[PDB]
Amino acid sequence: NPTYFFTFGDSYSQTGFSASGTQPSASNPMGNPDLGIGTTTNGPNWIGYLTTTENASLVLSYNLAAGGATIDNALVPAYPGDLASQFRLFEDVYADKPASAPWSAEDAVFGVWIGINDIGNAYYSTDAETYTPKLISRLESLVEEVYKNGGRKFLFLNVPPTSRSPLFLEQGEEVVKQHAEYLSVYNENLEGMVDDFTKKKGDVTTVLYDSWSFMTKILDDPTAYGFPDATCINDDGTSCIWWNNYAPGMKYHLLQAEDMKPKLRKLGGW
């Protein structure tokens, strides 16, 4: 009795899963590639950990996240594999509940972690109060596609403090500040949308995971989590918070997955 975990997002979530590669099964929950390959962490990322380490029951991972993704290239563009295109791949391959992935409302969880790149590309050129509602509205319309397919259990991660990634720190404290203020407005509107959606539908189970506060705790007191500082980069994924200048390593991702577990109990696989 598996949980079908369909995930959507950007480089913080990518694993290199192909819809034509080996598909998930009880013996191989990630499908492809091997657990620990294809990430920006030097090992498993939060999805790998949630599926194989923090799981309370069988979780099958269909990870449609793509590197550098924004929500919709008609708003803030970046790469072909925007969130809209990930939802289109879902519609093309999995939405009709094929025998390979015979999901139902009671056992499918749809996880979305998006916004890092929308904010990173638009924080200095747009007005957060009027522009982030347009991004959030497009996210909501994509979620509504999955709802119309019969999805009822949803996990949303808010945007973590990428303002404090080396990539932004090196741009100056006033740039960190401008980015952070924009991001805070985005995350507030994300919470408002998830709350409104949950109340309006009435038959969904939703989790909004506050990755921002969790990562911020670690950035504020890194040595309490086994990190020497909050700024170093190391591609071993464990010596520093940061695997490269913009994405955190596998140690961070495991700490986050462990923090997430209790909050995901209501979703069915944890």
110 φ/ψ angles, rounded to the nearest 5 degrees: -115, 110
CA distance 24 to 30: 5
Whether the CB-CB separation of 109 and 5 falls below 8 Å is answered with yes
The answer to whether the peptide bond before residue 80 is cis (omega within 30 degrees of 0) is no
CA distance 5 to 195: 21
Method: X-ray
- The string over 236-247, giving b where at least 16 C-beta atoms fall within 10 Å of a residue's C-beta and e elsewhere, is ebbbbbbbbebb
How far is CA 262 from each of CA 48, 55, 194, 259, rounded to the nearest angstrom? 17, 11, 19, 7
Count the helices and strands in the chain (H runs, E runs): 8, 5
Q: Of 83, 86, 76, 151, give the one whose Cα is nearest residue 119.
A: 76
- The string over 158-190, giving b where at least 16 C-beta atoms fall within 10 Å of a residue's C-beta and e elsewhere, is bbbbbbbbbbbeeeeeeebebbbebbbbbbebb
Give the bridge partners for 6, in sequence order: 62, 110
> Residue ranges of the domains in the chain?
3-211+249-267
* Fold of the domain spanning 3-211+249-267: Rossmann fold (3.40.50)
Task: Please give the DSSP secondary-structure letter assigned to residue 246.
Answer: S
Whether the CB-CB separation of 207 and 194 falls below 8 Å is answered with no
Whether the CB-CB separation of 24 and 102 falls below 8 Å is answered with no
Give the bridge partners for 209, in sequence order: 157
Q: Of 250, 155, 269, give the one whose Cα is nearest residue 209.
A: 155
32 φ/ψ angles, rounded to the nearest 5 degrees: -165, 150
How far is CA 99 from each of CA 23, 70, 102, 147, rounded to the nearest angstrom? 11, 31, 5, 20
Q: Which residues contact 164 (CB under 8 A, 6 or more apart)?
A: 176, 180, 216, 219, 230
Q: Which residues contact 268 (CB under 8 A, 6 or more apart)?
A: 3, 57, 106, 107, 109, 153
CA distance 132 to 126: 9
CA distance 119 to 212: 14
For residue 214, the tally of other CB atoms under 10 A from its CB is 19
Q: Is the Cα dihedral 80, 66, 8, 192 positive or negative?
A: negative
Helix (H, G, I), strand (E, B) or coil at 112: strand
Q: Of 30, 31, 33, give the one whose Cα is nearest residue 53.
A: 30
Q: Of 94, 95, 66, give the one whose Cα is nearest residue 80.
A: 66
CA distance 13 to 10: 5
CA distance 266 to 150: 18
Residue with tokens 């929500």, as numbered in its chain: 71
- Three-class SS of 151-193: CCEEEEECCCCHHHCHHHHCCCHHHHHHHHHHHHHHHHHHHHH
Whether the CB-CB separation of 167 and 68 falls below 8 Å is answered with no
- The string over 57-67, giving b where at least 16 C-beta atoms fall within 10 Å of a residue's C-beta and e elsewhere, is ebbbbbbbbbb
CA distance 19 to 219: 36
